[PDB]
Amino acid sequence: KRDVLAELGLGDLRPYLRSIGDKDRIFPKAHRIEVVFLVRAANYLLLRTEGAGTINMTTLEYSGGAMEVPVIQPQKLMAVTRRQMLQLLREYRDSLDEVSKRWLVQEVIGKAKDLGFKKVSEEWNCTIQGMDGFCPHCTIFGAALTEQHNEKFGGLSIGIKTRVRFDPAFATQRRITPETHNKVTEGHLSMTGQALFSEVHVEPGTVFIGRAELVDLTEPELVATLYSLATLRELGGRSGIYGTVRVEILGVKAGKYASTTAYDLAAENAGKGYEEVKKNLKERLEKLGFTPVDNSKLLAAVDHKDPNGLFKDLWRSSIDFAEKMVKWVEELKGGG
Ligand SMILES: [Zn+2]
Numbered sequence: 001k002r003d004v005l006a007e008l009g010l011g012d013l014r015p016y017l018r019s020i021g022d023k024d025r026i027f028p029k030a031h032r033i034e035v036v037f038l039v040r041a042a043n044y045l046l047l048r049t050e051g052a053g054t055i056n057m058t059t060l061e062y063s064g065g066a067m068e069v070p071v072i073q074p075q076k077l078m079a080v081t082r083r084q085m086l087q088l089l090r091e092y093r094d095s096l097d098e099v100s101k102r103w104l105v106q107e108v109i110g111k112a113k114d115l116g117f118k119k120v121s122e123e124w125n126c127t128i129q130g131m132d133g134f135c136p137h138c139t140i141f142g143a144a145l146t147e148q149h150n151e152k153f154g155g156l157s158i159g160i161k162t163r164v165r166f167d168p169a170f171a172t173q174r175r176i177t178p179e180t181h182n183k184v185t186e187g188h189l190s191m192t193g194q195a196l197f198s199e200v201h202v203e204p205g206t207v208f209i210g211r212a213e214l215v216d217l218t219e220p221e222l223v224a225t226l227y228s229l230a231t232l233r234e235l236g237g238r239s240g241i242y243g244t245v246r247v248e249i250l251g252v253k254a255g256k257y258a259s260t261t262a263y264d265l266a267a268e269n270a271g272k273g274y275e276e277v278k279k280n281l282k283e284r285l286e287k288l289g290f291t292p293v294d295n296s297k298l299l300a301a302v303d304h305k306d307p308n309g310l311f312k313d314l315w316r317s318s319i320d321f322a323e324k325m326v327k328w329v330e331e332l333k334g335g336g
Helices: 011-014 073-095 098-114 134-139 219-230 262-268 274-288 296-303 310-332
Strands: 032-041 045-047 057-062 067-070 141-143 158-160 162-166 169-171 184-186 189-191 200-201 207-214 239-257
Touching: 011 239, 032 274, 045 067, 057 262, 067 239, 073 134, 073 162, 073 219, 073 310, 098 141, 098 310, 134 219, 134 262, 134 310, 169 262, 184 200, 200 310, 207 219, 207 262, 207 274, 219 239, 219 296, 219 310, 239 274, 239 296
Parallel strands: none
Antiparallel strands: 032 207, 032 239, 045 200, 045 239, 057 067, 067 169, 141 158, 162 207, 169 207, 184 189
């Protein structure tokens, strides 16, 4: 049958992936898959801080000196990527006919009901902001679950941590609107000036270098994660980044330890523009032992609107995880 990993150059990843139905899905394996990607601003990108300590600008140190560049912080990357997976899940849902819908209701939603989950309407939906605690975006990117989500969690707080960890994504050039009139206030303090980066306008064409580590994923979870990234376009919501981007996956590598970081890659490419960066990066990734990814092939090999395509296996994988999670909670709570 169909083998999307083989269609992409990605067959050698298999030994490193988890299998749906594995009794030990909750137990971690001591390896990771690095994914390196590019984010390019189509129009202007607007960056906004969200609370004390959040940043839009950061320093790249490199051979010729130091430059402060725009940066997309990890929790913004999380927010937009998970919001995209969620939208793809909604479109999958809306692609179902009566036959495939009953599959979802009976084989997925029903199974979730049996497992104690409360958000089990036959009309499926989840948010990014309640959450069901069993859908692919919840299980992959994480959630804080309580008795509100699952009737078996009385007196318990159950945390799912993300299995997709983002580096910050770093711009290679300081291409921002010169702006002196941002203003922030709190009580009797106010702040303005050129160096206030509460809001940043990143110029069209700016490229950011990104990296993520993907751990303990199954095949469809991995592919759907790559695909959610690759299909990012309109960014918004409440995540502090707003505008249109194009994202390209450049390469993956499995290993016990990471071979690179977004920061180092960007620093290597300080001052350089899109085409030069992409060229340099492709070479660097090859030297680092990365398997190239054909972003165009990725987009075509996955049809999230096919009722029996990858997103079916994604849902199977998610409910599998959720089952193992519930079992783990019951087996480790120590009675009661
Ligand atoms: Zn969910």
